[model samples]
Target: PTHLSVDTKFKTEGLCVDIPGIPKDMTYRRLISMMGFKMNYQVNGYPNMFITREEAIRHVRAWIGFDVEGCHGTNLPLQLGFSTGVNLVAVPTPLMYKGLPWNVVRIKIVQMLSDTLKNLSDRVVFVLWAHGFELTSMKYFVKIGPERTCCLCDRRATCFSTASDTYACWHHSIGFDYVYNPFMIDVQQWGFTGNLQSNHDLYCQVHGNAHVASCDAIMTRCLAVHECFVKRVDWTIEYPIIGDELKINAACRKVQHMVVKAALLADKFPVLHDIGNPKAIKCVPQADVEWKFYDAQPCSDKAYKIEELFYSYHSDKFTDGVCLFWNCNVDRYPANSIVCRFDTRVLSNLNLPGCDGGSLYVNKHAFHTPAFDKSAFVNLKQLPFFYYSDSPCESHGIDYVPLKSATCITRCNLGGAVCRHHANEYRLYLDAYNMMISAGFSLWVYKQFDTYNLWNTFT
Candidate 1:
């Protein structure tokens, strides 16, 4: 027998890893917490990542239906050779390979490990003599517990395991064979789509690519709030998820266009991730794309970048004029919305005009007719609008577009000469009595008849 002696007083290699070196005392739970992801076990230096050849073979058999000893019905394992871009690596079948009859598919355990290690750079040590079985055994962890739904359907069923399977479902459901990536689809369409990227294209056409990127950081946080509170769970949280639609559309409307911008700016793939599930995969937000913009009016005819102008208005930059407007025509505003009409008696102290006519004024001098429109409020549901536009008047003054004789404008206004037709408030009670039988007299008379038993016996 031979015995070897080493000097522990000094050091074996004198190498120090920069990252907080592996903890002295470790367990699976503690390591998982630091790793923060399932596949990240390797970066944490998990011992199970490096296993014996026999153990690797056992796992391969269990996971992928490949076995060393072929039975009457069993097939042989495949030999895998592929380029890692940095190096061409090979993974040979466990015990079979030499002019085979059963080997059908190719495999690459070596390429997989090298590519994974490429994501991680800080390392304390490396070994050279490891076999293909040992390399294949270095499996990535599945961080979350389990998936219960397909990428498209919101129902809870078995989710596809690999990226390819999830992509396959898009083909089966939407008649498309490929999606850009899961993230773009998740936040934009909230389900599968034939061309989800078009949503981004439309927005970029309106807001400009740079502006869309700027809103993503704030929208990402907003999205996380809505998903965690309002979705997949009930309303026990009970807080309003306001501006969710605007925030969601702002972030995802044209996010696909960001890929080109991202690659050019950051030199990385523009694979977006859902901010809704922060515990899972992490991806970069376009935070460096600052959310600043030029001062814009409520309506600007020369605004090609209208989407950017829309948000700036929402932040309350353009309400300084005589009256703010929200288009009621769906064709005009998508929702009959926008307001901020000035109080009828307050004017002259500010830079903009005010009116005492108790009506919304579209005076051309006081308002800029942009090629697009903004609805400051819809139906005056909350604050910042008038309940009535009685004696409503438009600027008879030249250079103004009067929405004259448009009764729709007075739909919610009360007792006003301009557009009011009062309705009978007690009509509902009258109809309630009219539908009842003759036994329905006045309340007191009916009560007296029942108490005295003087009802007619005409049953």
Candidate 2:
């Protein structure tokens, strides 16, 4: 017979029971049924059965825990320790102490590790506490360059983009074709506040040999098993490692060379000085004016023609969304009529030369109409611009108010109304210009424009 009661102090859900003269061979199912429990309370509609945490741990695949010890200044691997929850193995690279080059010692260690990992099951999980340093060391230890690339038969004669990629590549080179997804578990990120050394001492009960790689790895395995099987905490967060560091550095040097070539081309022939001037006429329209007139006219008759012009130019490029216009007039037409568009949803204000106006309707082909010179119409000079409503209008509403001296580079500060007003349109121009420059091409083809001065003023 057994007396059962809830234990308030017990943190778990199971009830406490006292059994008198309990049989030594009593089964869990028989005991549960005797207590009037027909089904396992943990699972719905199932016969009484329980699986202990030890049983779960037995079913779990082996987790291979590893740690690396490196030299202080060189950060080169001196020793590697591996643990499989049962046995600890330490492999020391004394070649590093034999006065071998650090690079040579690194390759030896990497090969040793690679060979060791080849014998491990592909299904096994890799456990490491604070894996960044160890993982980085392993990644860099793999040789790079043409010879290594030839040995691996990889396409590029360079390192892979990520540390994980490099490690996987090294594995592939050693005939392990399956992609290696290292379980990379960091215990510190699991919200544990205790020191790892203290945990190691507590778990292993071995002091003075705390920093030894093998001991550290054993501690890692023990802690990982407890956390994963007992507490069931998730694996550590993995941030992406995009692009090979050395490759990016080398590529950036080539990028600078292209930039220099662009600067040279820019110095030879700069920005477009002439944006073309079409004949200006203040044409008043009749009531029955054809829809074609409204479509073709640069400026509408009711408002200044400049409004129609600005709207026409901008509406062509910014057809996807709504565009607002201010200061619409003919004075700013091909030259000062800088158009800006932003991918953001904020209201993109277009500054023309006349009066303020709301969203204006224009024919899609108005800018390309035969009424304007095609060459002149296409010659609009542009610069990078950003718009903010709070920026002060230093130039009132004027397009080209030289804020600084002519010698000063006229960068779009976006702090004043002049920059803010044209910022959106200017950004489009800048992207186009940059794209061309990056491709080793230049937009300034005509010798007529004093490109540098124009660029200084507009940019």
Candidate 3:
């Protein structure tokens, strides 16, 4: 009853969800279903402490503009150096059955910290982390397809060249394409490795094969890249802008790396911080090993230092779900899904990418494509059938950029790096580039809104 290309056929090693429709929210989990590893062998992203969860929380409290007065929370925020965009709500931004928008994730992290902390009152755990993604060149859009070489891993292979400037098809004799689906991961995880360090207590134990504790102790392991989210990405270069071209497979590394770079460079999150980029310190950690004078302040100021902790799966260890090493994904083999009422809604929207749902067309050769012709499609269906929630928990586009139309463009991406030098002055530049770009508001308005640069103060 099903049909596949004549040349494609292979059984997948892990649990693969090849369905076409279901629901929206559970889509992320659905993607995770493909990770062929043991569930217990996983670590989620809500990072706590690879070294000491309690200490990490206490330390985070110090730099977040609060005395380690008293705060208690299973989750805390990173206090770091820096901070993007979307708009288009005609359809109410189809809510993910479960997935969350990128910005929304920021919002929740803040709330989660505030709700969990104790006497510390309102110090949102300041967060400091770097992120980036590699993208393909715009020119090769026409030639690229589901099976071609990806924008990042072109390690040892020759792709088919149609013209001197055009590469139509690729034969990846080795590397990811030859082994696993090359495009399934975000390549930027490597270059930006220097600045990124989760609480080590948080999710993502595999820091580019370099654990956090080992890296912190020894300098060589410092630049470890973690496979935090093995997101199910479409094989082709999806997001395109005006500038990027040539589309060298290697440049994919640059695009994603720079995107994360631009984010820190832009620094607009009203209540967020990044630890890696110090010159771009967005905020201070709550607790501190030590404190020093900051910006004409009296001595002993709290700061968010870039510390590395490593989560261990080698033995007895457990971290929060959000910071788990294996990012969230739906269970495809139906260990449950359709059985649970709450998860049902999530199953329905599994294939929607714009709002935390979508499927990828990957290695037909690996998924045991049918040898003979058929009338029906391969594995594809609605997911998140279990996640049925009345709360904003399931409604509204929770994924990043659910709304990005022509008329309503948000400066979310620009806001992160842009800031006024003084907490009170809007004119002076915090960094060179932020000050250089027009604040979008004119001098007159700038004069009016310059009241306070940080969230509570500004406007």
Candidate 4:
């Protein structure tokens, strides 16, 4: 048993095992050192894990976390709060806060940010959460044109993509120099499970101070440290913001036009059901011309007596005799479509005012329809009447015109011909409708119009 034996079958391999009865608070470095093995293994495949808090703190020369607060609904920055690991500073624009005139606030905040950045050492890293808004605010205030030469690369820089993750140049310049590109870090994108508020509570231990710029900046630093050193998450990548400046400006202008158009439409249409209510209809300035003949009837069996109720229940309301049901069932069409009924009897005795003849019915499922023939009314002196069809304009040989100058208008592909008599009113309605489309709002005539229902249309 004591004799030495050398066997070719013996092979060396690494194995993972748990040692029992170890100290309750032993680190991986200590255990490896005790076992006389090299402490070279990676944890979670991430390198540069600091063993102590002091070591992690010394690893980065300095961390600067910044946040910007702007006026509600406006992208103008009112305050700039920054934390330099040891100190917190909140720079407020007095003129902007006081709603004063002139460029005092913009100049002050821009100068403050520039001075603070210039005073910091080259080893500093700028940190922020959801950095786009802040970067946009800075980009606006800095007023740096595309022709300006970058201080770092000494080349003409076009623009920076605020949509990008980190701040670098398209040219891949190194180190810090002014606003061209810096080592900016977005802590929000670090795969942290908890939200910003929860993380702030966990790391800062202070509540009810969420939106304050300095407090958030402080939380940003702590979270960065916890993720980078203690938890040892993978390091974030540095990408450049090399977007085209002109394109960004054009995009912003497009969005602005859309918002303005929507607001204008909201002021005009306000609600759909208001088309029937005499009292509610007053909210719309052009309701008299556009919705004069329209009457809303509930979607039920009782809606068949809309003619009887039009004069009896709504005698005070004026109508050329057009009844609109919010929902209806028509043959060969989908259920719950919008139905419009025209009372021929009410139209015949316009001077005496009565109803006895049968009604013509048309249903619209969407914006355009091809159900009715416009040429069939040659006998009544080419009587101008609204026609509904469920076919494309090309099939009917009627070229689909714009809402502003339309012989026909379609909603959801269900076409409705504007009566030649009310062509002027239809043009006005089209103007409003086109504005709504420009503003990115959907108009569903089937739904009941309420204060809350149309809120989404504007936003």
Best by TM-score: 4
- Give me the overall lDDT of model 1: 0.23
Relative to the true structure, candidate 3 reaches a TM of 0.15
lDDT of 3 by residue, 6-89 (tens): 122222211112223423333223323322211232233211111121222222221121111001111322111111011111
Please give, for residues 372-433, the per-residue lDDT of candidate 1 as tens digits: 22332222333211111222333232122322332222332222333212112112222332
Q: Name model 1 segments beyond 4 Å from true.
A: 1-189, 194-197, 211-459
lDDT values of the candidates? 0.23, 0.32, 0.20, 0.33
lDDT string, candidate 4, 1-459, tens digits: 221111111111111112334454534345324333332452322221112233223323235666665544142434555663222222333112344322444434323444443322222345666433354344333322223443346544322333342233334322222343233445653455655667755533422354566656656665665455333422232212222323333433333233223323434432222223223222224332233334432221112233443345522443222222322211221111123222222221011111111121111100111122222222112112221222233421132353433333233222244333334334444454444233222222222222222233422
Best by lDDT: 4
Q: Give the per-residue lDDT of model 2 (tens digit) for 1-459.
A: 111121111111111112334444534445434433333243322222232333223312324466655533143434555552122222233112333443454444434444444332222334555433344444333322222232254422212323334434334434222222222333443455555566544533322244565556666665655444323422222212222323333433333333222323334322211111233221212112111111222332222344444364422432222111111223223432222211111121111011012121111110101111123324344332211122233433423433322221224442233353345434433444444334222121222233243343233
Model 2 scores a TM of: 0.26
Q: In model 3, which regions exceed 4 Å deviation?
A: 1-277, 280-459
Name the 10 consecutive residues with the lowest summed lDDT in model 1: 440-449
lDDT score for candidate 4 against the true structure: 0.33
RMSD per model, one decimal: 28.5, 26.4, 28.0, 27.4
